[PDB]
Amino acid sequence: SPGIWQLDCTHLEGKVILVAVHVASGYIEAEVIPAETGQETAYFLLKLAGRWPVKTVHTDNGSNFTSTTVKAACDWAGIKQEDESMNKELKKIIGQVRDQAEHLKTAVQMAVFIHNHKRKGGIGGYSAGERIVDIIATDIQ
Amino acid sequence: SSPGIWQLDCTHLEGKVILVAVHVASGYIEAEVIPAETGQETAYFLLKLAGRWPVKTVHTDNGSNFTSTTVKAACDWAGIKQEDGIPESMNKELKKIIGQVRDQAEHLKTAVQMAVFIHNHKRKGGIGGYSAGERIVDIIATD
Ligand SMILES: OC[C@H]1O[C@@](CO)(O[C@H]2O[C@H](CO)[C@@H](O)[C@H](O)[C@H]2O)[C@@H](O)[C@@H]1O
Ligand SMILES: Cn1nc(-c2cccs2)cc1N
Numbered sequence: 001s002p003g004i005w006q007l008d009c010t011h012l013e014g015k016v017i018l019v020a021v022h023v024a025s026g027y028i029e030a031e032v033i034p035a036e037t038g039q040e041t042a043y044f045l046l047k048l049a050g051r052w053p054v055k056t057v058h059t060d061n062g063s064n065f066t067s068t069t070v071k072a073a074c075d076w077a078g079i080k081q082e083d084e085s086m087n088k089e090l091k092k093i094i095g096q097v098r099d100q101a102e103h104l105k106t107a108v109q110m111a112v113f114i115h116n117h118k119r120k121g122g123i124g125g126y127s128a129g130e131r132i133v134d135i136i137a138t139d140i141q
Numbered sequence: 142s143s144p145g146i147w148q149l150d151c152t153h154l155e156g157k158v159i160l161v162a163v164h165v166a167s168g169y170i171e172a173e174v175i176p177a178e179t180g181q182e183t184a185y186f187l188l189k190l191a192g193r194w195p196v197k198t199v200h201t202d203n204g205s206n207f208t209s210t211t212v213k214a215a216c217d218w219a220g221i222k223q224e225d226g227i228p229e230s231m232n233k234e235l236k237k238i239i240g241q242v243r244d245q246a247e248h249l250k251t252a253v254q255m256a257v258f259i260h261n262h263k264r265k266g267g268i269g270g271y272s273a274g275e276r277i278v279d280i281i282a283t284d
């Protein structure tokens with residue numbers, strides 16, 4: 001399960017936030033896009049797969065994933081498509097920083113920073129970002 | 142190199158701008174096509190990068206986009222030590238790979254992400270070697 005991601009959309013202030021969660025770590029990647037289109041979905045997936053070893057993405061089965069451009073990007077990147085706890089939290093963190101920035105895009109990326117750096121537990125814990133890299137590094141044997 | 146050092150560099154193609162972040166110790170890259178080398182685009186790029194990887198230090202070319210106060214303010218918010226004017230064939234290599242995949246993409250930005258994918262997955266130094274993607278994770282894993 002080092003290659004398993006879950007992708008969802010959240011609609012806010014009339015734009016769309018594409019959120020990808022690495023299911024094993026809780027690590028998040030997100031973008032704000034003007035609209036939930038095939039072109040934007042494909043691009044997002046391609047960016048993700050170039051940065052992390054993406055095997056399988058679980059989606060909501062919306063029309064943006066049925067696109068010939070998404071199928072092509074998935075074939076090219078070797079991504080297989082199939083088919084909240086962390087997504088609900090991301091919405092909460094976006095509210096807590098919302099006032100610190102003019103644009104929603106900024107607030108979103110500040111929330112991704114906060115989420116991925118935040119140590120869970122006491123001294124001896126890990127962040128989501130530590131967890132993804134430890135998991136992947138461990139798998140490289 | 143030290144694990145938290147990234148080098149930012151820009152490259153220009155088909156009259157658009159490619160912002161490139163190289164993780165110095167591994168050669169791992171992240172890139173985005175942006176409309177223009179503005180303060181807000183640069184800030185936003187850095188904020189994204191710093192949310193995705195441990196970014197302690199950034200070396201820049203000291204372009205005007207890095208002297209803007211929205212960039213300096215992002216780097217402060219994110220705890221990034223901005224090091225302007227601290228020192229090339231990474232742009233050469235990216236452009237070459239972009240040339241190989243260019244005809245498989247309707248739009249430049251897609252060919253850029255395809256080229257980033259290829260660079261990061263390419264095994265460097267023979268069959269027992271490792272890709273940039275493998276090197277970065279191995280270098281920064283703490284446990
Ligand atoms: O809000 C989008 C934001 O991303 C940038 C680069 O940091 O451009 C890319 O962003 C999206 C990636 O999913 C795409 O919508 C866009 O096509 C792409 O170039 C910024 O320029 C932009 O503000
Ligand atoms: C301390 N540390 N932080 C990380 C992150 C990875 C991705 C986001 S943050 C990885 C390690 N080793």
Ligand SMILES: Cn1nc(-c2cccs2)cc1N
Nearest residue numbers: 051052053136140274275278
């Ligand atoms: C083949 N492969 N590629 C990786 C990457 C790690 C980070 C980016 S890509 C990890 C493994 N096992």
